[PDB]
A paper describes a structure:
The fourth structure reveals a previously unknown state, where the 5′SS already forms a duplex with the ACAGA box of U6 snRNA and the 3′-end sequence of the exon is loaded onto loop I of U5 snRNA. Consistent with formation of the U6/5′SS duplex in the ID B state, U1 snRNP is absent and most likely has been released by PRP28. However, both the conformation and location of the protein components in U2 snRNP and tri-snRNP are almost identical to those of the mature ED pre-B state. For these reasons, this spliceosome is designated the late ED pre-B complex. The 5′SS is specifically recognized by residues 1548–1566 of the Endo (named the Endo-loop). The nucleotide G1 of 5′SS is sandwiched by Phe1551 and Gly1564/Lys1565 of the Endo-loop, reminiscent of that in the yeast endogenous tri-snRNP or B complex or the human ID B complex. Recognition of the exon sequences is also achieved by loop I of U5 snRNA, which forms a duplex with four nucleotides (G–1, A–2, C–4, and A–5) at the 3′-end of the exon through non-Watson-Crick base pairing. In the late ED pre-B complex, conserved helices α12 and α13 of SF3a120 are anchored on the tri-snRNP through direct interactions with PRP6, DIM1, and the NTD of PRP8.
The RNA helicase PRP28 unwinds the U1/5′SS duplex, releasing U1 snRNP and allowing formation of the U6/5′SS duplex in the B complex.
Residue numbers in the entry:
A (entry chain 6d): 10 to 59, 64 to 85
B (entry chain 2L): 7 to 95
C (entry chain 2G): 300 to 328, 394 to 447, 454 to 485, 490 to 1304
D (entry chain 2M): 15 to 80
E (entry chain 2K): 12 to 119
F (entry chain 2F): 402 to 463
G (entry chain 2I): 112 to 222
Write the structure that this text describes.
Amino acid sequence: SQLLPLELVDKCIGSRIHIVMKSDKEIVGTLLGFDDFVNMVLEDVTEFEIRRITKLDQILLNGNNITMLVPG
Amino acid sequence: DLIFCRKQAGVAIGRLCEKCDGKCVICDSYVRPCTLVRICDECNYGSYQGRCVICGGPGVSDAYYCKECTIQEKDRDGCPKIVNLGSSK
Amino acid sequence: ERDTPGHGSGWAETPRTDRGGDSIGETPTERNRPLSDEELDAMFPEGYKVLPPPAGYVPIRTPARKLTATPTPLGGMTGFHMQKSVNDQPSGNLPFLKPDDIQYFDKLLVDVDESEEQKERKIMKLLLKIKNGTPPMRKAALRQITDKAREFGAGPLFNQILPLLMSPTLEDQERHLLVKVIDRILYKLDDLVRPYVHKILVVIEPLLIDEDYYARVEGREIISNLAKAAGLATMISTMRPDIDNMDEYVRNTTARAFAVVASALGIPSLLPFLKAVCKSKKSWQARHTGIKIVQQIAILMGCAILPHLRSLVEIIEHGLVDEQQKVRTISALAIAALAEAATPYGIESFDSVLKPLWKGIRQHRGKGLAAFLKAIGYLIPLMDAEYANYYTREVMLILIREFQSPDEEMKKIVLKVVKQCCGTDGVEANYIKTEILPPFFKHFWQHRMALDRRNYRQLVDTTVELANKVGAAEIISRIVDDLKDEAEQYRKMVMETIEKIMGNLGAADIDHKLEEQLIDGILYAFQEQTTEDSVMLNGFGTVVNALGKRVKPYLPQICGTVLWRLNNKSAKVRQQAADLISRTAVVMKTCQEEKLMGHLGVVLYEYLGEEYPEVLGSILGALKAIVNVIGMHKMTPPIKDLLPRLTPILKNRHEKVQENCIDLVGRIADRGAEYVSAREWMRICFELLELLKAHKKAIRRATVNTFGYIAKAIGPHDVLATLLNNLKVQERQNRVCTTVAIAIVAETCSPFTVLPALMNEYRVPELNVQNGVLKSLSFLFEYIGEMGKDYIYAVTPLLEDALMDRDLVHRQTASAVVQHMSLGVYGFGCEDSLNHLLNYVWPNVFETSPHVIQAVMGALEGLRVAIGPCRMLQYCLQGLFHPARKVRDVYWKIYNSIYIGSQDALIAHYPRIYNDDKNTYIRYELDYIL
Amino acid sequence: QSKYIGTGHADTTKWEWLVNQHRDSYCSYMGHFDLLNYFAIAENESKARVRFNLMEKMLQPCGPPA
Amino acid sequence: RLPPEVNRILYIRNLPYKITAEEMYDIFGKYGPIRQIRVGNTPETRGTAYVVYEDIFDAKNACDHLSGFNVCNRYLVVLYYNANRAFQKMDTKKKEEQLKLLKEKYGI
Amino acid sequence: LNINYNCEICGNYTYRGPKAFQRHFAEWRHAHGMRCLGIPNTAHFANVTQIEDAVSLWAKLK
Amino acid sequence: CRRIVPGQFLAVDPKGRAVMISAIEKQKLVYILNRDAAARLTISSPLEAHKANTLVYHVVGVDVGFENPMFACLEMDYEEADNDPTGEAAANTQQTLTFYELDLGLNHVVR
RNA sequence: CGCUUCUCGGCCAGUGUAGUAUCUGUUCUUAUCAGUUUAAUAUCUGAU
């Protein structure tokens, strides 16, 4: 019955996601994929300080500084 | 409700859809195709160009007759273009 | 009563004149219209008293209105008080009574016997068992009424239906059924229906003019069945007065009626009537109708109008010049429809029509104008491109000036025209390129259009034909840029258009740069699909298979998307991309991009664990087509891996799976089939066996053919031994497919092996498997043909046993065996036995049981060709004149079937027959001796 | 069946059945060249006068109905 | 603001076989003037009655409130009567006199 | 049954039932009136009542 | 050899356009001919002359240069001859010459 | 997720259209003649 978090990340693949660093930074783009360490592949990602950059292509975002993941 | 038109047998090659595709028309059967289908453009015309000789879809192939109906010589009667109870065309 | 009827019409409109005039001078000064006791004895049926309660009672009633306002404003309110019952009201039915329907079935709120007619009405509520209830009830009740046709007679029936086929709240399912009753009883009653005929159409004709496609076709069916069923002069004498009936609706429909009755009884029967109508000088409204009639005749009878064409037209010309407009309008319209059934024929019959038409074209404003086009356009194909040449050159102008109208009736018309005008052999290329195109693409290609249905199609067509002439790159060049316009239906349109064009014209014309714009396009479209639709997909496939090795630089971008899409985007879109591979297999091959074949092979291979059916299906499909390009022994998931990997899927229940799977398994177990160790197969067998629960034909189809393929791989005995065990519980002919295995199997090694197993297995006491083996022989001989010249003997005694009764079914199926044998052997000389069997067949001749009989007819027909007539006829002599009816019925039906074929042979075999007083029955010729 | 001539039914009269097979005898005799020549030889005429005669006897044979 | 099917007629049921035109006329009398009434007096139609008013909206108010209304120990089935159907037991004839009459007096 | 009816071709005869009429049609005397009238027997003429109409029907036959 | 199926008598036009074929009785069909695109002979679809209970003695192509073509069916009806209990219609029938007329434009064939 | 213990396993009540078959229950072997009907019955139709 338990909902595993990695399963929650898995289903948001190909969706839009907000990724919230432990700092005051945020990235929103399409979630292409992730690994066990929760490193993350984003596509066409907006970078924010809470608009820094419009990324075009694929970003590997180091799971190290990730704090929160938000589908949508 | 469903029976032959049996109008005269022209030179127009028969046309069958996906569904009907294997069937020797009168013997209902897949067996031993040999010889070829003819119907009247009266039966076969226009929207019926390449239309199914049964169901009303587009023809992807050409019905072959069985041999069974062959030696019983039925293939030579009026054109087997089935008319349903409603206006065939 | 007919004369009476029309009298009642002239009445009706005289009345509407009185009232309408009364508010014409009243305006110089409906359902609520007050009523008379004769009028009031006109509605409610028989069997009710009118009342009086009191002249004081009916005085308060008389006081009611005046005191409805008066006592509407006065004192009242109502007060309940806080404080051995009985009387359970009896409602409902086995199929049950809706609340509303009480009004019809009310008399099933009474419970009695001993009333006689009323016992027939009260027994005809069998309907309700038609209208509502369970399916089986509907069935059985339905026949029970059919055989009760003659008996109750129409009158009571239609008296008791037409209310329901009129029901304000009648269900669509209920509609269609109650139609079924009207047909079915109309297979019977013939002379009977006469007084009812109009009293039928009035319900039906609305149905004939029906939005639903299947509705209409039913309607037509029964209006023939009636009209032919009744008499011609019945139909006519019936249906005049609806011609001038005020409502345009009833005319309109009334026409389509006459269309049908005319398809029934032929035009020329009916002509002098029509031709009368269009010369009716009383009023036009008729003529508007009569002409319409011509039309719907045109549409229905269609290609067959041809012979009386000239007459029909000879009606309709006298319209075009008329003073009233519509009559012009509709008229011409008909000419159109005619020609459209005329196609390239009867040109000069239309002949005397033109010269007005052309002139008429000039002077017009409005719907009529474009109508005349609708005609001319459908003419031009019928002319001589010298005469047609001239006349064409005149039209293409007005056509030009008229692209632009807001009218949609218009744009349809002028459109279809261009198809024809510039749809011509005798028209010059550049000219189109200049004058027409730029308008064309301008005003037409717009978002108004494609949202609508017809216009969508008609458009596509037209543009296509402008391609077939001016070339390809011209068109496609101008509409490429719109794949990237947003809204779908539009895109869909450009897409399919192109698809056709590079269908017909061929890719070969297209330049380069434009082409980049294609593939960039055809992806950009393909990447965004609202639904999954065949359109973009096919349209693509054709694109590629046309471009051939011009395509090659573009793959990486394709297959790149193919994968990317393939994954994510969540599964709905997956199957699409899958198919996309399905169709482009061939292109990935011959160009020899093998890294691609590594990619596909293996990565598809992974998905085969995908749980959604509608993906996995398309997945396999892709696999199949992948196999048809790269051979077995080069398969990158080398079969050993694969084929088992499939094997467990076969449970999958869901459809598309079972299809593509068994398909796949088939290809591979046909072609490679060595790659996989036997054991695996026999697992496959024991898994196949219950694929024979398939609701669908195609599955079982390829299923069987596979069963064979493996049966080759292994060898027979087992696989039939195994089939012998299978299909025990198949319902009503479901198992047969197993038998079909026994057959195909029995070919694919020498059946000459297998029989003894089979034959012996008819010993088993279990009845239905017995008959099973009989059919096995049936399909068996059907599939072997010549070879039967041997094992015939083997079966013959068995056919003797089975053919002798246990039950019908034995005789039926067995007899079928006789058939296919009897053809197959033909003329190798094994008759003797077949004669012998003929005996044990013969008595079966007599029965009502439809399957047994049409079986036997099967038998004796074939047997004729095997034995020859002369022997047959020697069974059929005595029968002809046998006193009884029963026998003569049949022996005649046989002797016919003998007779039609081989009539040429007989002569020899009529026996000598002694000549009587008035006549000579001895044919003296044959005895002339040199 | 009906529009295919020579069709019978159980009401078929003696006379009609026999006249049928007469006629068909004939269109055979016109047919099979030899058989014809046979007749010609026996009863000495032309081929023609044969065929002609036959095509007289076509409607008649047996004589009037009953 | 009305459904087209309903008509100045109502089929009316669940009646006793004793029951009175006096009761009837009174009760129904609320909504508006009675065109007239019929009562099934016959072996089958004993138990039911038809009611017709000088206006529909009369009847509308009727089927509105009288819906399932009570009499004695019974709830009256209250329905808008169908039409067309079996009437043609009569014929439409008897224009001639009348329409000559409007033809005459008013001259119109 | 016991309902008044009449066949015109047979002696303007009276029949008391509608089921009776089909039996009368498949009958000796009814076929004698037809065939001796020149209107040949069996199943095309079944619905006959008056002598006149089946004469034009038989002209349609031959 | 049938009574009703063509191939017995055979006739054909001067201009070769169309060819008529006939049994002895009841059936007369017609095949139209035109040379193909390359002037190689393409055969039309058939037609029908059907007329009931009619004996065709002999048929012959007719001459009309570039017209709707004609044919001569020598005929006789026997239908009179059956329904004459007497044996008068046996005599006193005369064989009926009829010219049928192909008509291209309309494409049927009319007595 | 790793380790230990125990259990098991593998290898060397669908649906729709048309149609027939087969049990049981209920009614009649019962007066004459005239028609319909049947191969002949039967059956159906009237009155004493």
